[PDB]
């Protein structure tokens, strides 16, 4: 019966909640009491990339920390050069409604997707020198919210159909499908070793997935509303989520709990993007206050602010080498902060 | 550098195509389409000519793009903000749904469900300024339906005859009362007309009015 399993199921949530208390020896705020603070993080707009004629929804650095991609509703996907601010490629999209971007770790491929329910993959290095679309991954039934390449052949995507998928670009079929989310999935982050990836969904939960098996390892709760951004700590043993509760929270995978919450009474708008620093001591979070905050990730004290945008900060990515932090926004401008 | 100088020639050749493409898109008119499943949006789309479906058509040298987003079946709260900046929101309601009920719910009328969707759209924080064209479809079937069934089944309070003219008029005004932004957005309501091919002409006149009234605002002459 429904009741037998439900009265059973609510018990299984207890042992999980019971054990998490037993492993709550002391709060990170208590352990990190004697760390010297980070100091004022004064970060200035070095470069400003112009040429989008609509709001920007996604951007992603390259593994070389110099080139980057950005999409907007203008139906243009532009590959920028951050050093010289000059446009390398401007890819026309079939669908103006794009919500995500990814630049392949090899830099040969770039991928974008949105309300068209398709993840289109564009080939950059092409004998005839004109970025051409290689494959169109059509197996989702809701808007694609995020996508991150594993190799030049594996891409994992998260959609509004409450499911994530791992694809095989050559065959164009979902090698694995991750189901378990009870709400619309908003963002995913791959681990440094590319063996696990955590996803955040509208059901105020984040789930740690296994890319090979295709089953969810752990599920983290604690937010109160939608989770809009997620990123791992550089060491892959922690991650942070940005929600509409205007709080960012740092979860651990080993301890399976929540460590910090980055809330300030003054902040009441929702976090749109989060990202870490190369060392993981700074957690940069892009709010809807039209500005972007920089948090001390072990003290939870808002040390520094990057306010330069007219409209909301949609996307916020840091480079692999950590020399720079770039924020997009609905004001149609990408700004490189250093 | 000789290579870098040529690099900047691309970036300028890119930017001159992005401006030309941006100025081509600015001339296009962006209408969002909404409504219930059985609204008649299908019949409207036929007269004008998975995922988010686009329809392109031209009338009197103006280009229209209609975004039929009925097929998303996900939470509107996360992707409706994509459509801020449409010229107008076409909204289709079927007049012959006053006496029915949704196939899923018990006794919540289809017409009352249409209002719940209309309340959330006209007062959505993303469309504070956006005008709403409100098509009321299947008007002829509503005439036959009202001549036999009462309108009290849907609206409990109603003083008025079962006549087409008065029955309809109450609904139109009942839909028009949902907006709190009374003097910010204008709801242009039309009864769907088959042979005259006026449904497209009403869209034309309603869109120009939204453009002409907007033009009067930014130039301060209003």
């Amino acid at each position, epitope marked *: 019966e429904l009741d037998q399993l439900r009265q059973e199921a609510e018990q299984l949530k207890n042992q999980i909640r019971d054990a998490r208390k037993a492993c709550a020896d002391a709060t990170l705020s208590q352990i990190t009491n004697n760390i010297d603070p980070v100091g004022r993080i004064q970060m200035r707009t070095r470069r400003t990339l112009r040429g989008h004629l609509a709001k920007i929804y996604a951007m992603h650095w390259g593994t070389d920390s*110099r*080139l980057l991609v950005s999409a907007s509703q203008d139906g243009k996907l532009i590959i920028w*050069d951050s050093y*010289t601010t*000059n446009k*390398v*490629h401007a890819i026309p999209l079939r669908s103006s409604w794009v919500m995500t971007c990814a630049y392949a770790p090899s*830099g040969n491929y770039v991928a974008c997707g949105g309300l068209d329910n398709i993840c289109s993959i564009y080939n950059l*290095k092409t*004998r*005839e*020198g*004109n970025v051409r679309v290689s494959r169109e991954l059509a197996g989702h039934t809701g808007y694609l919210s995020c996508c991150r390449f594993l190799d030049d052949n594996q891409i994992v995507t998260s959609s509004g159909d409450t499911t994530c998928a791992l694809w095989d670009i050559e065959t164009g079929q979902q090698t694995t499908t991750f189901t378990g989310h009870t709400g619309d999935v908003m963002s995913l982050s791959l681990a440094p070793d590319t063996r696990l990836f955590v996803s955040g969904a509208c059901d105020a939960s984040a789930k740690l997935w296994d890319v090979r098996e295709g089953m969810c390892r752990q599920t983290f709760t604690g937010h109160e509303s939608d989770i809009n951004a997620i990123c791992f700590f550089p060491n892959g043993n922690a991650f942070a989520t940005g929600s509409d509760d205007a709080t960012c929270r740092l979860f651990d995978l080993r301890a399976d709990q929540e460590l910090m919450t980055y809330s300030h009474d003054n902040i009441i708008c929702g976090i749109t993007s989060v990202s870490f620093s190369k060392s993981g001591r700074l957690l940069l979070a892009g709010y809807d206050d039209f500005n972007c905050n920089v948090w001390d990730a072990l003290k939870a004290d808002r040390a520094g602010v990057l306010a330069g945008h007219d409209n909301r900060v949609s996307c916020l990515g840091v480079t692999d080498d950590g020399m720079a932090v770039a924020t997009g926004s609905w004001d149609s401008f990408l700004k490189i902060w250093n | *550098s*000789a*290579e*870098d100088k*040529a*690099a900047v*020639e*691309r970036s*300028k*050749m890119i930017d001159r195509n992005l401006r030309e493409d941006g100025e081509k898109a600015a001339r296009e008119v962006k209408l969002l389409l909404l409504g219930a499943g059985e609204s008649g949006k299908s019949t409207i789309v036929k007269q004008m000519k998975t995922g988010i479906v686009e329809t392109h058509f031209t009338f009197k040298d103006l280009h229209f793009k209609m975004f039929d987003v009925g097929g998303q079946r996900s939470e509107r709260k996360k992707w409706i903000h994509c459509f801020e900046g449409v010229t107008a929101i076409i909204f289709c309601v079927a007049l012959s749904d006053y006496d029915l009920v949704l196939a899923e719910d018990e006794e919540m009328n289809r017409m009352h469900e249409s209002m719940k969707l209309f309340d959330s759209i006209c007062n959505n924080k993303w469309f504070t300024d956006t005008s709403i064209i409100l098509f009321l479809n299947k008007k002829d079937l509503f005439e036959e339906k009202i001549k036999k069934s009462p309108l009290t089944i849907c609206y409990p309070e109603y003083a008025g005859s079962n006549t087409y003219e008065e029955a309809a008029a109450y609904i139109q005004c009942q839909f028009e009362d949902l907006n709190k932004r009374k003097d910010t957005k204008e709801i242009y309501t039309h009864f769907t007309c088959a042979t005259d091919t006026k449904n497209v002409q009403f869209v034309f006149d309603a869109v120009t009015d939204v453009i002409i009234k907007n033009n009067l605002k930014d130039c301060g002459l209003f």
Partner: single-chain antibody
Amino acid sequence: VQLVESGGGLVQPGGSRKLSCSASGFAFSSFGMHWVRQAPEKGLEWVAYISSGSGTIYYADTVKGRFTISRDDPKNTLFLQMTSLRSEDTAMYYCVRSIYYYGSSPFDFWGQGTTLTVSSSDIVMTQATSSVPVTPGESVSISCRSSKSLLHSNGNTYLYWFLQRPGQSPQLLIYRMSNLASGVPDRFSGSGSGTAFTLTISRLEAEDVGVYYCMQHLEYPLTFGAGTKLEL
């Protein structure tokens, strides 16, 4: 992705002839094109260049104001208008394509060129090796010297390499030092700094025997080097 050029043949001196190169199989409208001529017995020599969309047109010292170069993007053709040919314009006129953006490979594809026989502050690249004997399966190094520091401020040493097999068009091997072109085996490698450059082949074959060239791209007019023929 083939490039073919038309014209050439036999022309009396002082005559004006036109060379047309019909691009086919690639995005011709977004490629900066060149012309490079090779004398019947001598090495390569740059002559002209057009940027993308005819925005920038350059010329060599010997052909300045004598040659007119034009492109017809809709028809995917490239034109060269030659005026008052001299006896020193006898050369095979290759047509080269090149695209300039961060990380691109200019001078990657070379046309078959046309034969033209007329009746009758500049960087200098120097390589003093010619007809070097070599055996298949050995390791050979080809050295190049410049008269100017090609290492630009950003760290790009704009030195290129080419390989011309006997009776074939030149083929790019290395588009900048410590870089490897597309479709060329891993055996070719190049390491150098400032004015000293080397090209190292680990193990070769009968396929890669021929003459090698060195080109700089730091500034126009893209002076080439003399040949370096591998003897076998």
